[PDB]
């Protein structure tokens, strides 16, 4: 055969660039001037990452990134 | 004991990554503290973030974890090992930490008396 160079496609796909969030640890804990803390993120009851891994506060569900567990 | 606590940090942190017993950085440290698997916490006072020190102190106060300070940020890179070392022994690319938490120690004697007895003195 002979090479025919057809590069035409629906423009070009763009690879998902992640968003650089600064100090994401801040929003998980609410710290007052009295020392006591409040946990603003609901936590997943599992064994692989329990006691420290927070879930996703979406508009209709709670979702753990590591567990892939979703509560609706 | 012949050396003060400012040199115990250069031998307790230098002999703990060999056994992989750290949570270097802030998020690893917070995970370790919430996991009830923290023994020593190290802070640099040079951090100008207001909400950093507050939450770290609050977590280190609610839990019974010893709090330490170094008063310098960048040099902590050599205490942990985030530097590019040269053949002559010149660390050039230095990235310093702000919250390093120990989870385990190694096998040495020089640092087993210097800073490890600086706890009950605060009681
Ligand atoms: Zn989980």
UniProtKB/Swiss-Prot annotation, chain B:
A Pfam family of this chain: Ribosomal_L7Ae
PROSITE patterns xrefs: RIBOSOMAL_S12E (PS01189)
Disulphide bond pairs: none
Localization in the cell: Cytoplasm; Nucleus, Nucleolus
SUPFAM superfamilies the UniProt entry points to: L30e-like
Quaternary structure annotation from Swiss-Prot or TrEMBL: Part of the small subunit (SSU) processome, composed of more than 70 proteins and the RNA chaperone small nucleolar RNA (snoRNA) U3. Subunit of the 40S ribosomal complex.
Descriptive protein name: Small ribosomal subunit protein eS12
